[PDB]
Symmetry: D2
Subunit: 502 residues, 4 copies
């Protein structure tokens, strides 16, 4: 702590993944190009908003912008596509027939909440439609109703037959399709609804890399999501979003069933006391690091940058601390979706994460993740931990890993080497999904499968050498670690070589 040098510059290699929510402000092809250059690694599409056609056009735009860099495979960056589900939630309608329109609420003003489907696209400062039909039976005379991540509070004054009359307890902007939270109250909502099924099936068709599953409360919820994705979506990674008291207390069984976790602080910070979020966050990140599964810190990380070109000091702190905690990915929501400075938001995340990674003392973290990690017979596991240990020993410029499914690179990443992990694959999905794991730099090889297997290995290794040289991870005289197998196919990585850069 005391020997932290501020006048010491960090490397160009950023290890933490940046996830960006794509909406009205960042949807265009030209913006998305600059998003990738700024350091976007994953595009998140929020299915609480917009239509299937809307999201399909966005996915197309993301891919168009991504593939404009495809001509140079050495410098090409894979960008993942993520589907964020609705889940068992209560949401508002469209303001003035638009997904963009907002109305200003005054403190003390009257607001009627209707269940009438005709007002679902005609919401304003006087009337607001909600999609929860059983709402009048779960609220009391004086109950508190929160809207848009708790932004606006509403006290029940009148409880009618098909409506609720409330008073605005605090002012602020109300937009379209905003989340409604009822702390303590019991919601009969299913884990996977009919809309969820259709959205999940749509993701399979659109060829998504991962699903961010909203409001996961238990292990059986994760199994339901996986069953809906079926055999077609068996390789689609499921990231369980923990955003309520139920998901926190049953986190262990959820983590076990999921391919990864997201700390969804927006909803979580109203579902549980705001002063307890940091505890849950640090608990979840630690357990994910221990289990070797991806964890995302999300929501309101640079909230003030929606309206402003520079973050608050608390926001600088937040991003940095999330990385220091051990988060694999950091996330931008409204900051890229609807804000005035989406590029600045991404750029700020690049800079803070890069600084935070230089602050992490890697040896102590590895030594702990080492003795905590159990004894296994798995050859790939032993080769991974042997390579990470060797990387610290010879101050390697990289750890080159050849991988078809990603698994080998994931096993190296869980021991948190300082050296960047260059994951060479021919599988495009594997290259996109690699961004979920801290310190993996995925590179897609499109060279034809070579006649002799030994020469196919050497070519892929040489490809990584060229990538590292061009990006600046290493130069001619440098020492690197190469991980390969003894035969083609997944699950055969058993070889570690200490080689000079050609």
């Amino acid at each position: 702590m005391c020997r932290l040098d501020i006048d010491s510059p960090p490397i160009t290699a950023r290890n933490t993944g940046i996830i960006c929510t794509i909406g009205p402000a960042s949807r265009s092809v030209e913006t998305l190009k600059e998003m990738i250059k700024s350091g976007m690694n994953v595009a998140r599409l929020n299915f609480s908003h917009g239509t299937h056609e809307y999201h399909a056009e966005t996915i197309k735009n993301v891919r168009t912008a991504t593939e404009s860099f495809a001509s140079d495979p050495i410098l090409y960056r894979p960008v993942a596509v993520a589907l964020d589900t609705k889940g068992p939630e209560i949401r508002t309608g469209l303001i003035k027939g638009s997904g963009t329109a907002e109305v200003e609420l005054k403190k003390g003003a009257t607001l009627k909440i209707t269940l009438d489907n005709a007002y679902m696209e005609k919401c304003d400062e006087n009337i607001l439609w909600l999609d929860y039909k059983n709402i009048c039976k779960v609220v009391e005379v004086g109950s508190k109703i929160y809207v848009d991540d708790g932004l606006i509070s509403l006290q029940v004054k009148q409880k009618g037959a098909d409506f609720l009359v409330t008073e605005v307890e605090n002012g602020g902007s109300l937009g379209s399709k905003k989340g409604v939270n009822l702390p303590g109250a019991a919601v009969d909502l299913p884990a996977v609804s009919e809309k969820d099924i259709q959205d999940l099936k749509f993701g399979v068709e659109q060829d998504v890399d991962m699903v961010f599953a909203s409001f996961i409360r238990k292990a059986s919820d994760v199994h339901e999501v996986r069953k809906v994705l079926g055999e077609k979506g068996k390789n689609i990674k499921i990231i369980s979003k923990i955003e309520n008291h139920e998901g926190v207390r049953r986190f262990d069984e959820i983590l076990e069933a999921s391919d990864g976790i997201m700390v969804a602080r927006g909803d979580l910070g109203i579902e549980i006391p705001a002063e307890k979020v940091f505890l849950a966050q640090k608990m979840m990140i630690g357990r994910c690091n221990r289990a070797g599964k991806p964890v995302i810190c999300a929501t309101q990380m640079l909230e003030s940058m929606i309206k402003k070109p520079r973050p608050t000091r608390a926001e600088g702190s937040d991003v940095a601390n999330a990385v220091l905690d051990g988060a694999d990915c950091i996330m931008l929501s409204g900051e890229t979706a609807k804000g005035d400075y989406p590029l600045e938001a991404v750029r700020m995340q690049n800079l803070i994460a890069r600084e935070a990674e230089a602050a992490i003392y890697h040896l102590q973290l590895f030594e702990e993740l080492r003795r905590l990690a159990p004894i296994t017979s798995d050859p790939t596991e032993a080769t991974a931990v042997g390579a990470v240990e060797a990387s610290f020993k010879c101050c390697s410029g990289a750890i080159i890993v050849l991988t078809k499914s990603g698994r080998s690179a994931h096993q190296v990443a869980r021991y948190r080497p300082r050296a960047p992990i260059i994951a060479v694959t021919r599988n495009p999905q594997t290259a996109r999904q690699a961004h979920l794991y801290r310190g993996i730099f995925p590179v897609l090889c499109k060279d034809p499968v070579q006649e002799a297997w030994a020469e196919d290995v050497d070519l892929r290794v040489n490809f990584a050498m060229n990538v590292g040289k061009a990006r600046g991870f290493f130069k001619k005289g440098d020492v690197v670690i190469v991980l390969t197998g003894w035969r083609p196919g997944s699950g055969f990585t058993n070889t570690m070589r200490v080689v000079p850069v050609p």
Copy 2:
């Protein structure tokens, strides 16, 4: 991994809360509620307001504080802090015509003038500022930042007594906003004529501490120390680190100072914003190791100026600052001018409490005790003995009798979990004790007993009564009591392990 969420924290909150006073929190009624909510130190910001204004503020603060004096057991001392203006650069007033704030669009040209004719006629074309020698210290290509670093300008043409700039980052420009010049060596005095006037006022008004703005070196601290003079020699100097040079020369500043404030507002503009966390954690750690108060400040709950609930980044920022090892946390605009000042204080009490319960206290003490050098000082030896004993018997408190505070400070250095109840007759000592994590000051107003042994146990029993009333411990519980062998400061040598009467 082992961190528990559904397990609520304990009664006592260790980290001090500093609140900036202004229009939103100036009345006696509001200040009473601030103290109820948890305010320990009231900060007076001398960048704004006359001496009359601040004298009234101190008057109000003391009225609210002394309304609880009827019960010395439950009485909570409130310190008064003076935050100096320092070598500040500010803009002029926006012209009467037009709007309250002028829009500065990206790519546009802006003229910076020093001509007093435009000092109350600022707009999107012409901007006045009060730093006379700006042209001498900036060059073509230099960056100029306005209004908490939200506006950015680059110098295109350097004139004789003017500057032609290009707007880089846009926004709304209001009246009298702060200006920063990173990289440039500003030649404004460390302690100006106004600063001298204000520091003297602080002495006369009997303030407890000074927050000295823009301390760049050790000699800056000495100047402040000299101005406070002999009459104000007991006033603690907290040096604000908020520029590049303050970071480079931190070690000599900390040595000269009584404590440090991580003033992240200006700091986050003078150096890159992505580097502030490094500086914050470096300074807190070094202060903890030195046994000196450290305050984390600025924008901790910004959105709570307008919103009754903080952002998730803000919730994290307050907690991480406590986990880092900060003795105090601060609110500025959240309490000075915001719509929800009491909610801001309450949120800091809540977060701080949770973070303290999260701290692995035994490991922290182990790390600090190992780094603490060997000394023949009896009080130091007694202090470490006390903290060690408090972890062994899960004591409800460490009772410390102190005149100047030093004995209680020495115990606080080793960061025990048990609350340190510092019994004192000195009113200033009880106020200044809030700068130190874990110290709960209690002011004994009882007459001094003729026999010294009976006087001690009177003050010890006073601590037993405070601890029972505030929920620190019960009759069955066991506590640690720190006393001395003779009257006067510098004689604490005795540690006793006694049950609660």
Copy 3:
């Protein structure tokens, strides 16, 4: 640890007084008043009387001589060193008779020669190289032809060639000196001996009458064995410390329950080294010492530590290493048997143990040992325990010359000793038994106050503290300017220590 292992310096002299207790067995070689005086000067803390040999008259005269030598230094209480008396029981053992009617006489057994083991009681004081008598009458049922019988801690191995009804004929498989009343071990064989024998009852009764400070209970196999010694000693011997000797497989296997019932432990290697495989003793020793350290109960390392010094004026390199490593393991006391009992160089043996132990103590990284014993120390409600930990931590902080403890029963001083301070613990007591028993605890320097109790209790406390201060200055623990820790209580009685003061030396 390896970083600190490399920094060990032989040119760095030990400047601190010796903490580890030295226990000597008293026999023919050290019985006289003249020799016992020199032994106390050389560093003897505890006299051990082995009741497997000699009679009650023999040991009573030995105790008398120990007390005569000890009290010859009593004129000056400042320099006076308390000397404890320890009774070592027979236990469920098998022993030989007297060689040629003498407890000192020896015979040379030669490899290959035949030897007859008889049960006939006419030979019990007439053993030689042809005939040997044992007290275990049920030996013919537990032994078969081909079985091996070990004599005197496995020194002599014998093989059974012919088995009779009341006699065994054996062959000497290896030569060596056979003495009187030596231990007989049959590993694996199921012996049916009681925990407390008829002879043990008489000896323990003798032990109470003679006012001994501690009992070294031989061949303790289980927790009910310790409870049985505790019951036999009764209310009369309730203050007598029971040190259970671990000497066999069952003793090691049931160590936890034994330690819990006992006041302390002795790692009795002589018999243990033959009852279990010799190559496994070091594990037993290290396991038991560590558990005793962590439990805060005294542990003794015993037997063959300087074995060659029985015949030679200097130890082997192995013996030099053995003492050192015993101290580094965490043994409160080290012991001499034959080296002091029958050897030609009893004084040189004690002196050598003083030298090695003092060197090993200087090598102990007290910063690390205290760190571990404190982290693993459980949460307490006892104020005496908390004051003790506070005092030890304060002593490392101000590099004290000593921790001064006023104690009645010793408990307060013992509670300080378990956290292993570097500073010597000057335990001031008016209780003579407390002063003697304190030698079982590492780092405690027991001082007996002879002064009459002052009317004012506060002035009586100050007199005892100043008395400790006089001892510390005289023995060279500290000078005038130095800083010490003083532990006292708030009221008269036992179990009231709660006050720690950091005071300068007058």
Copy 4:
């Protein structure tokens, strides 16, 4: 927590060095020595002629090569030469009277340099072979005889004689060693006899030299120069047995291939109570540097006359291994004793127990931490292999090596798993015994045409060896270390492979 009811593994890591003498010189006995676990045969050149030692080496090799018919089970046995050095020794006791003379405490004793008394020593008069003794000693100086058991103090100092008083008495025999603590003995570091003996060692193809009384780096360089290019591959193990040797340890270790803690002379030259400090210091520093350290002398001294050791000796052997010693040694136990085989067997049993007591991960954590960041690829591969061996509870680390170097680099990080070192160099196989945990296996199969298959052949050979010795079975996982090309210095490949 340590448990005696927990059985240790088959693999014993600490090498056993046995001094050969009249009690163990025969081919028949040496065969038993090897089976009981002798790894290195030590030849003490303080005694015997070149003719004598040549026959000893001949016997040791005959006994070693009797197992050569099965390469899978063949155990390499090293030959060590232990120099006389700057020794001081007494003369012969006179023919008349008893074979040994009793020296009594307080009695007067005269020390002479007159060659007429060199075989007429008695209780009144004694001769010794150090001609310049009077020049380096003063009145009051202490002189120790026969392993420090006899102590004399100078009372009168002449030109070529001494009058002493006996402090510690005892029985004095013939040609007994003399020590002069606190004296600057000016005898050559490498004498003319020493040169002859070292040249002889090169001729007889010895594996290592135990150089007596090394005081400084220049002494080591002198020994290195005598061995020359002809014997450059011979390892020099410096014996530390005086005060100057300890004081100048760092330069001695740097110059030498390894260290012996020669406790016999050390415990006389420095106070006996300080020997354990010097031992633990020197072992730690050797562990830190990755160089072999031998603990020697009196480890099981009573086993010269007794079939079972003392309890002090038991712990001594164990604590040597727990300290981190690579090799443990027997002198008189195997050379002249009544129970040489029992002494070897006992060291095998204690060392195996002590190795099971070591917390290997904690030791490896400290060894890796104190090791510098290097560019050396072999160094990095070794550290990765040891790490991987802890993670998958490997049955072994197989290392292909020519000079031993690659296996040595693994051995210094102290893995739990045995290091099977495959080599074709027979000298490498013998010298590998100096390093804790290395099990050298000599492949004698002809070099296969295809190099990739030649590597696989040696790897498969190690698999068969581990299977036969019971280190692992078919289902088990092992670590394999190989290089990218033939020749030394190219080890860079770690494989985790199942047993065939």
